[PDB]
Design a binder for this molecule. Structure first.
Ligand code: VWS
Ligand code: VWS
Ligand code: ZN
Ligand code: ZN
Length: 592
């Protein structure tokens, strides 16, 4: 093991030779511990959103979010039992077939310094781009620096030689302030993963068109429609089981299966991806910021299995592995795989290959898969109790005894997916919309959080305006959110550009980051560009933009019907005016 990780620990040890020591009392049980060294340390409430959402002031979920994968929890420090030999064979056959299916039209390729620089710059507009970004360590600054690219080249040369000298990721046990040199090693490590494996996201290998089960690039506004289209396929209930800490359940077998994509690469690409897989994915070196009685320390730990949650390519490889694990469960449900097949070290391929070649693509079309998140509509309900391979692969379902059957839904609208459920709304003109929805306390609680501190009223109001505009595009069908959205947009200067991100979700397309008229953006998203909207007649007024049924709105967290809500709705112009007075002499517009 030290042959692959030695150089990295050696360099960390050398750079921190003053405070370096081996703590005999380290909390690590399943991660190899190498040593520690001394280190430094360091969310505000959005007063604009808070002032305009008074009824939610002390509401439990909202108050919780104000305080509250990157964290090194108890579950990260566990081992997953090794899958059985027949299970390992099935996974290998399925991984091989899946990669060949996913690569039928696309060819893997290297991603570039220019692609990375463009992504950094375009996302730097929305504030922070990375977890390691300080007020001194800007990704935009680093990307503009030729010295950063020189270090990248030097690390690549080591990777070409089958060695790694500086590729490390970080975890939380008040982020430690480090050197520009340390930050460059981190960003360079991310660029090198991006160069070798970024094609998966950049070339949309997991788009629905390319992967059948995938939803990458679709957007939150299409997710409900995809679930409604899956509902039309004949079969059993729709299952959406949650895996307890998916990333900790990624086995050495899963890692070796994900690696098979290198077989489709050109030699110069194959060489660099092979180095990312073998040296960094299969031999992780992690820095964990741990508090001690004297001060704060940084632990240098390492391990072979599990998913490096901090590493580029995680989404795609998680999506790949989940698609694979769900096909295997589908096969077990269909009686293709028995307990005796999973235990068998000489399991015959014929029937697994036959099922994949004849039913595989149809079976992928029955799923909506986004990383560890899955919705499956099997051919019948034998799937509910087909748990032998799922548990054996290590994908143990969250908060349910291992052998208790899964509970599915017979209504796609009850199905949870990507932190949402989706409703079908009838418009006054008879056209139907399929909208995303989540508990309202979660949306308001999120909107009340400002990312960091020292943010001026102007920057704060603009984040609020971004949240308000997201609500008008995605959550317009919630009475309280449309009202709060209209109040926020009325209180914030009309020509001020919404800045900073509202969400880090892969499904967010940020159509709300504009000064363009929200009704126009709404029409473009839900009517013009909506493929499930056959009649393109534009909606000319918000009065024609529908709401959830009163009962469904209330069930999903609405405060409508309460006195505190009625009082808020009536007194809202007063709160808007107060926000206006503090912002000052600017151009405002009344949206109430
Ligand atoms: C673990 C992690 O996942 C991310 C997922 C997305 C992002 N942000 S980013 O704008 O979208 C992005 C996404 C991909 C790449 Cl190569 C660069 C930057 C950052 C992280 C991150 C981290 O900074 O540590
Ligand atoms: C916009 C966006 O959100 C994400 C949310 C998650 C991910 N997953 S990712 O490959 O695993 C990843 C992991 C770590 C880092 Cl630093 C960047 C990206 C990627 C993106 C992404 C992108 O453009 O690549
Ligand atoms: Zn490296
Ligand atoms: Zn709802």
């Amino acid at each position: 093991n030290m042959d692959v990780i030695g150089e990295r620990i050696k360099r960390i040890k050398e750079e921190h030779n003053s405070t370096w020591h081996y703590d005999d009392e380290n909390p690590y049980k399943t991660w190899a511990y190498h040593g520690s060294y001394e280190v430094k340390a360091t969310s505000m409430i959005n007063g604009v959103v808070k002032l305009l959402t008074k009824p939610w002031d002390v509401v439990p979920m909202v108050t919780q979010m104000a305080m509250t994968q990157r964290v090194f929890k108890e579950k990260v420090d566990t081992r997953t039992p090794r899958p059985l030999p027949g299970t390992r064979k099935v996974m290998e056959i399925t991984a091989e077939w899946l990669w060949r299916t996913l690569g039928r039209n696309k060819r893997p390729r290297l991603c570039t310094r220019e692609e990375f620089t463009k992504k950094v710059r375009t996302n730097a507009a929305m504030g922070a781009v990375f977890t390691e970004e300080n007020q001194w360590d800007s990704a935009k600054a680093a990307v503009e620096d030729e010295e950063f690219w020189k270090l990248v080249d030097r690390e690549r040369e080591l990777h070409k030689l089958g060695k790694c000298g500086s590729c490390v990721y970080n975890m939380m046990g008040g982020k430690a302030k480090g050197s520009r040199a340390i930050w460059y090693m981190w960003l360079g490590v991310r660029y090198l993963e991006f160069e070798a494996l970024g094609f998966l996201n950049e070339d949309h290998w997991f788009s629905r068109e390319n992967s059948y089960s995938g939803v990458e690039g679709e957007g939150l506004h299409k997710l409900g429609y995809i679930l409604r289209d899956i509902s039309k396929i004949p079969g059993g209930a729709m299952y959406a089981d949650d895996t307890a800490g998916w990333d900790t359940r990624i086995t050495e077998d899963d890692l070796h299966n994900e690696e098979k994509i290198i077989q489709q690469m050109d030699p110069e690409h194959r060489q660099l991806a092979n180095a990312i897989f073998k040296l960094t994915y299969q031999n992780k070196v992690v820095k964990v910021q741990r508090p001690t009685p004297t001060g704060t320390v940084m632990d240098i730990i390492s391990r072979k299995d599990q998913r490096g949650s901090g590493q580029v390519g995680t989404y795609g490889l998680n999506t790949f592995t989940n698609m694979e694990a769900q096909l295997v469960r589908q096969m077990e449900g269909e009686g293709v795989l028995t307990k005796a097949d999973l235990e068998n070290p000489h399991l015959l391929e014929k029937k697994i290959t036959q099922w994949l070649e004849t039913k595989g693509v149809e079976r992928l079309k029955r799923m909506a898969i986004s990383g560890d998140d899955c919705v499956v509509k099997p051919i019948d309900d034998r799937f509910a109790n087909a748990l032998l391979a799922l548990n054996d692969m290590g994908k143990v379902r969250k908060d349910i005894p291992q052998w208790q059957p899964s509970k599915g839904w017979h209504d796609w609208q009850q199905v949870p997916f990507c932190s949402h459920h989706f409703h079908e709304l009838i418009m006054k003109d008879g056209r139907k919309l399929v909208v995303p929805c989540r508990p309202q306390d979660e949306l308001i609680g999120r909107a009340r959080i400002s990312q960091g501190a020292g943010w001026s009223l102007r920057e704060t109001a603009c984040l609020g305006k971004a949240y308000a505009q997201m609500w008008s595009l995605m959550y317009f069908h919630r009475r309280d959110l449309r009202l709060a959205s209209n109040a926020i947009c009325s209180a914030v200067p009309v020509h001020w550009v919404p800045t900073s991100r509202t969400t880090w979700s892969i499904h967010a397309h940020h159509q709300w980051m504009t000064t363009e008229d929200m009704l126009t953006v709404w029409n473009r998203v839900w009517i013009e560009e909506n493929p499930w909207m056959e009649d393109k007649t534009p909606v000319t007024t918000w009065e024609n933009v529908p709401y959830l049924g009163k009962r469904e709105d209330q069930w999903c967290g609405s405060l409508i019907g309460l006195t505190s809500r009625a009082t808020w709705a009536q007194n809202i112009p007063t709160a808007i005016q107060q926000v206006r007075s503090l912002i000052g002499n600017e151009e405002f517009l009344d949206y109430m």
